[PDB]
Amino acid sequence: KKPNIINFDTSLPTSHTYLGADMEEFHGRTLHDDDSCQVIPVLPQVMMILIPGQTLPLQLFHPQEVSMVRNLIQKDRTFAVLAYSNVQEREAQFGTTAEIYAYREEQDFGIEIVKVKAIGRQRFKVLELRTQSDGIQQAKVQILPECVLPSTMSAVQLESLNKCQIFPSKPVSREDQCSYKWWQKYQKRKFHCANLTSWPRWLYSLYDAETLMDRIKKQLREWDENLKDDSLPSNPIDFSYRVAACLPIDDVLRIQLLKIGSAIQRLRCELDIMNKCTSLCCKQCQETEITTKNEIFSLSLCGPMAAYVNPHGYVHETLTVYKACNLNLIGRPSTEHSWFPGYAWTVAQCKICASHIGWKFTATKKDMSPQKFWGLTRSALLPTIPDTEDEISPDKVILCL
Amino acid sequence: GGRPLQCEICGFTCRQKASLNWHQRKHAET
Amino acid sequence: MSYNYVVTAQKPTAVNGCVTGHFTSAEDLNLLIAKNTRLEIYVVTAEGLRPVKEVGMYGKIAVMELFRPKGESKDLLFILTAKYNACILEYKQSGESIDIITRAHGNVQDRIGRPSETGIIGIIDPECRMIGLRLYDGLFKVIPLDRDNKELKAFNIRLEELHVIDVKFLYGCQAPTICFVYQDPQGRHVKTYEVSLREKEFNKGPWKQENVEAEASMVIAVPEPFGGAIIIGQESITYHNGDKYLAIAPPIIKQSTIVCHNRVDPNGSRYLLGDMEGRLFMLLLEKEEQMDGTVTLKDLRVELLGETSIAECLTYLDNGVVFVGSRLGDSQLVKLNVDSNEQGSYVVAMETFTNLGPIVDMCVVDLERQGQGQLVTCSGAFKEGSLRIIRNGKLHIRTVPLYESPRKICYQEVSQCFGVLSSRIEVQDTSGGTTALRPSASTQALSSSVSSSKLFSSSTAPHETSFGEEVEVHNLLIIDQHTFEVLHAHQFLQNEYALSLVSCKLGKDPNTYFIVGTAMVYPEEAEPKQGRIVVFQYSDGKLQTVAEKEVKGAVYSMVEFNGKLLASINSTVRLYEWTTEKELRTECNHYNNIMALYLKTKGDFILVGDLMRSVLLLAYKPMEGNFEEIARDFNPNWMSAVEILDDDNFLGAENAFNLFVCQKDSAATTDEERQHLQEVGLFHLGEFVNVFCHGSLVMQNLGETSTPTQGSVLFGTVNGMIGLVTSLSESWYNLLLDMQNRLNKVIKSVGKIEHSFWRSFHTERKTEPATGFIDGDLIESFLDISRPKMQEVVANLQYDDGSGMKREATADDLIKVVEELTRIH
Ligand SMILES: Nc1cccc2c1C(=O)N([C@H]1CCC(=O)NC1=O)C2=O
Ligand SMILES: [Zn+2]
Ligand SMILES: [Zn+2]
Structure with a gap:
């Protein structure tokens, strides 16, 4: 469907204004060597599976959490986040590091509150877990390397054709007619030597970072028109992590995608998922359809989905959509601690299983557009592949590519 | 007097005591 | 190991x-x-x-x-x-x-x-x-x-x-x-x-x-x-x-x-x-x-x-x-x-x-059933495209020009003929169609034909093209094994690409057929969303379209699997059975992948291979009528070709002109240990391999129950190089590696470059030394050096003759061993 996108400000949520006065920001960054062994503390109640480059807000209340934060503010400001595969047994084999970039303590109303904004950095595999006497647990971890490869043609590339492997006036004039001509010329030239192998050009084109990024850009523009090629990073690694961070998936599939080492495989998986899963149903019911990707749109600068923090220190990987259905509203609309300034939220439950799905944002002013939208929590949704296909060949939820 | 009860996970407002205890059971269940 | x-x-x-x-x-x-x-x-x-x-x-x-x-x-x-x-x-x-x-x-x-x-x-x-x-x-x-x-x-x-x-x-x-x-x-x-x-x-x-x-x-x-x-x-x-x-x-x-x-x-x-x-x-x-x-x-x-x-x-x-x-x-x-x-x-x-370079595909055949062996390869490209026939004489080669790019190849015993996939280049002529640049095998065929299917006429209505643009016209050529004449040439549909080719008998039909897999290529949407599997019969000097089956993807590869037809479609693997009505019916499927490009089989074991994500293993379960994922590898390196050594070892060539070999595990231990593959062999070949085959060009012994080399796998590359690989025993490996070190101690290097560094697994990130391999060229070079140096090499070396007693090795013993080794190609 084709609704409105004008009037609001996509930069309001990215700032997370709901956390209050401007925090004490830090700019000194840290990154360890690849395959290096490091001992890092773990946050307990972080039931979120972090992605490198993903923003994460937190409101901590427990005294131990506040003490660990105080100790880290002077040091490297880095901690770990476990990827809980089985939340019941607290099992985690992988995880992601997180660096604090904004901080503010508050002893107001007779309660030790601490507000923090952090960002993802590096992936890692768990080696060992220890627990100190003070409750805070440590983790002996191995940094996972980012495996990057040269172009498929590098090995077969003929020496005579090495020259002019570079294209004249590198970029296209943004237009996709000039760009279709450009992509065809690009494929004929870059993958010419493909004739020397067992496969054709169009196959290799599927494993080229540039082509994959362009197709992903074409899918992204479909969600929001306020996109410029500048906004997105050019580095395929950072690009892939950014794309993955705002794709609504279940935990198992998120774990699987994080396990990927090469950016090429990550991008392939992302495109595959974007094409496959056209439905989004209730995670608990599995049969109750909630929405489709046609209704997806980016209400923030990062993307359609992002992690936000609530008044009680719970994180929600919430997704912004135009339309939803099969939902009963609980309570009355409120602006209390709203993530999208100028809108009031209303709790939404599944009319069948009565499981929380998200909230209904309603505009406070009449001039605002859109007047209403939906924010669905990722933990409560399930991406579903379309059935049909003559119904002689069915399937099951699985990550292809 | 006894103002409404709400859930800390999602803000789900309710009335009678154990109703919210039922609602909260549906979050961290799986 | x-x-x-x-x-x-x-x-x-x-x-x-x-x-x-x-x-x-x-x-x-x-x-x-x-x-x-x-x-x-x-x-x-x-x-x-x-x-x-x-x-x-x-x-x-x-x-x-x-x-x-x-x-x-x-x-x-x-x-x-x-x-x-x-x-x-x-x-x-x-x-x-x-x-x-x-x-x-x-x-x-x-x-x-x-x-x-x-x-x-x-x-x-x-x-x-x-x-x-x-x-x-x-x-x-x-x-x-x-x-x-x-x-x-x-x-x-x-x-x-x-x-x-x-x-x-x-x-x-x-x-x-x-x-x-x-x-x-x-x-x-x-x-x-x-x-x-x-x-x-x-x-x-x-x-x-x-x-x-x-x-x-x-x-x-x-x-x-x-x-x-x-x-x-x-x-x-x-x-x-x-x-x-x-x-x-x-x-x-x-x-x-x-x-x-x-x-x-x-x-x-x-x-x-x-x-x-x-x-x-x-x-x-x-x-x-x-x-x-x-x-x-x-x-x-x-x-x-x-x-x-x-x-x-x-x-x-x-x-x-x-x-x-x-x-x-x-x-x-x-x-x-x-x-x-x-x-x-x-x-x-x-x-x-x-x-011979570039070799894209080949096959080992015995035209004159001597038990010796002959090789047939698809070499060249474009107007230089050709076929090459190789045997022992030293080596004897026979050329067959084509003037169009060859792709795959196959042989039929019952028909005494070869089937080859080819592709010519045409240009958008003055009218709506296209015309050829030069005469090729597909245009000079003694008998020709065109496909006539009407399954994709509608839906993605064919799209226009501008004047002066080039396009690839695919063809299937049937050739005689003796005369090498262009017996038949079948021209495929427009916007189509032939990917695989096999010839065998399936079900209980005694006739031998040619099976081809295709994919519909369009300049829009990257990976194809359509494809065909066609079955032809060669009889009376002409190909007859026997049967067809549609698939919503590209048929990358196919193989004969205990009377049934195994195929790959995008990220899926599908098994077909030949019905009594002389058609095909699906049985089971497997999904998770990056792409099912390479396929190989041995008995009830199947090996699937990706372009970068290495491979995985499957096994057909009789009663379940399904598959079971056995093991897998992770390393992201551009695969070029793969092949099955035996029921426990598997070889694969990759990007940096390297060859790595993996292994499974039959023991108990844990499900986690069985399901992973161990990189038990690494080597730097210096060539880009494209095809593997089973067989050899030497007579199949039988006279000696004590064969030094077990197994035989030929391979072809891009620079026109052909090689043979085999398996060895533990003792032979140890002794030959000691000989490797002792030889390098003496031999002069062209440019004073250490042999151990030249044969080291190399990529932009990691450079490791070879393991689980023996360089045959260096072992063979022992025969050409002077005798004083031959004696220097075999000095203070323990050798076991006829698996008896370990004794001091003489130059004559090593000469005999190396001669027996050289006589494998
Ligand atoms: N008033 C309450 C009360 C309890 C829990 C929550 C809220 C609330 O507003 N949010 C979210 C939902 C609405 C929003 O956008 N920002 C939040 O912090 C909660 O989890
Ligand atoms: Zn539900
Ligand atoms: Zn709740």
Whole structure:
């Protein structure tokens, strides 16, 4: 469907204004060597599976959490986040590091509150877990390397054709007619030597970072028109992590995608998922359809989905959509601690299983557009592949590519 | 007097005591 | 714990480089030809070429240039390998023994840097003052040409020009001036610098920075008396020299870009140019004597000479003789006469030299059931496309031109005929259809046919194309095994691509059929969403379309699996059964993947392979009528081909010309340990493998129950090289590796490059030493060395003859062992 996108400000949520006065920001960054062994503390109640480059807000209340934060503010400001595969047994084999970039303590109303904004950095595999006497647990971890490869043609590339492997006036004039001509010329030239192998050009084109990024850009523009090629990073690694961070998936599939080492495989998986899963149903019911990707749109600068923090220190990987259905509203609309300034939220439950799905944002002013939208929590949704296909060949939820 | 009860996970407002205890059971269940 | 053995049965034939000079003596006229890892020297005679020496190096020849220093008897050679091993060489002859000496050697590989876009570049100053190399974008490595630099010490100078297309040295310049063409946001430009040795840096160039064609693809250093430089592109040919500028836009070259060249006349009056389509042109420069005596460039001129083999390099050999070094087709020697032939061409073909590279697919067959073995390969590409037949004689080769790109191959015993997938190039003609450029096998078929299916007529309605565009027309050719005639040629549908091919009997039908898999290619939407599986029967000298089945994806590969037909469709694997009604019905499926490209089977085990994500294993369960994922690998490296060794070992070639072998586990331990594959073998082949086969060209023994080598797997590559790999035992492996070390202790290396470093698994991130492999070439080289060195090698070595007692090894025992090994190919 084709609704409105004008009037609001996509930069309001990215700032997370709901956390209050401007925090004490830090700019000194840290990154360890690849395959290096490091001992890092773990946050307990972080039931979120972090992605490198993903923003994460937190409101901590427990005294131990506040003490660990105080100790880290002077040091490297880095901690770990476990990827809980089985939340019941607290099992985690992988995880992601997180660096604090904004901080503010508050002893107001007779309660030790601490507000923090952090960002993802590096992936890692768990080696060992220890627990100190003070409750805070440590983790002996191995940094996972980012495996990057040269172009498929590098090995077969003929020496005579090495020259002019570079294209004249590198970029296209943004237009996709000039760009279709450009992509065809690009494929004929870059993958010419493909004739020397067992496969054709169009196959290799599927494993080229540039082509994959362009197709992903074409899918992204479909969600929001306020996109410029500048906004997105050019580095395929950072690009892939950014794309993955705002794709609504279940935990198992998120774990699987994080396990990927090469950016090429990550991008392939992302495109595959974007094409496959056209439905989004209730995670608990599995049969109750909630929405489709046609209704997806980016209400923030990062993307359609992002992690936000609530008044009680719970994180929600919430997704912004135009339309939803099969939902009963609980309570009355409120602006209390709203993530999208100028809108009031209303709790939404599944009319069948009565499981929380998200909230209904309603505009406070009449001039605002859109007047209403939906924010669905990722933990409560399930991406579903379309059935049909003559119904002689069915399937099951699985990550292809 | 006894103002409404709400859930800390999602803000789900309710009335009678154990109703919210039922609602909260549906979050961290799986 | 796996142990294997690799040997070369055929030397790489693809010509990647050639030069001329005076290497053997100041009098003799020498021509040097590089063939990846081999180098051949020839003396130019008026009739032909006289071979003198052929050497094998421990490195992939990347750059090869001759030069003459001051105070030297003859020209010295410089070679730079792919692993950045540089060496200068001189020639010496002491009677019947001819050996190549290494003057200076060393490695130039930097700790960090971005390997260049346009590959490694290497140039020499005309006066032989220094050697310039470009290995990393922005860094120019300089090697001073002083006699003291035996170690080949170099130093880097940092460049502001990032994406440099080309660079050369200038002639008649008092300063070692470099002129180079690069690109920036504003366009492509030509710029000059002066390399200073005592400053160890750059100084302002003599000329200005001028803009050039956006498609400037080549630079040519003009010799005296002219000097300056020439710029070649897609549509323009210009000449710059400070105060001198000339330009010509010959329409004769606009059809294809020029890629290679060489100098004809030393003075700079004539140059040869070669394009991508195999056309050879001649550039001619004019002069005009001034009163001062300095000849100025009056004008330029280009004229097409003719058509030859698609060239990778060129060179002039006096007496109007020219050498066309091709790596797609057979290399050539041609003559240039001032008068055109009856056809209108100035070039006359003098001789051809077979070139198997590039091999894309092959098969082992026994036409005359001798039990010996013959190999049939799909070599060449485009107009050079051809088939090659190989046997033992030393080796005997038979050529069969096609004039269109071959893809796959297959054999039928019952019909005594071969099936081959091919692809020709056509162009959008004046009307709506297309027309062919030249005659090929598909157009000259004794009998022809076209597919007529009407399953995809609707839906994605065929889309238009503009005039002058090229397109690939696929075909299936049926050929006789003896006469090699183009018996039949079937033309596939439009917007279609043939991917796989098999021939077998399925179900309980005694007839042998040809099975093909296809995919519908459209310029929109990357991966296909459509595809067909077709079954044909060859009978009475004509193919009859027997059956068809539709699939919503590309049929990458197919195989016979215990009477059923296993196939791959995108990320899925599907098994088909042949019904009584003579059709196909699906049974089961498997999904999770990156892409099911490679497929192989053995009994009830199946191996699936991805382009980068290594592989996985499956096993057909009888009662369940389904599959079961057994094991998998993670390493992301560009796979080129795979093959099953036995029920526990598996081989695979990858990106950096490397070969890795994995293994499973039958023991208990844990489900986690069984489901993973152990990288039990690593090796650097130096070739890009494309196809594997089972069999050999030697008689299948039976006379000796005690075979030294177990198993046999042939493989073909891109440079025209063919090899054999087998498995060994633990004891044999240990002894042969000890022999490897002892041999390297003695043998002279071409360029003083350690053999252990040359055979080391290498990638941009990690460089590991070989494991679980034995280099057959080095083991075989033991027979050729002198006897004193043979005795030095086998000195203080424990050897077990006939599995009896360990005793001191003599030279004769090892000679017998190595002879028995050599007799496997
Ligand atoms: N008033 C309450 C009360 C309890 C829990 C929550 C809220 C609330 O507003 N949010 C979210 C939902 C609405 C929003 O956008 N920002 C939040 O913090 C909660 O989890
Ligand atoms: Zn539900
Ligand atoms: Zn709740």
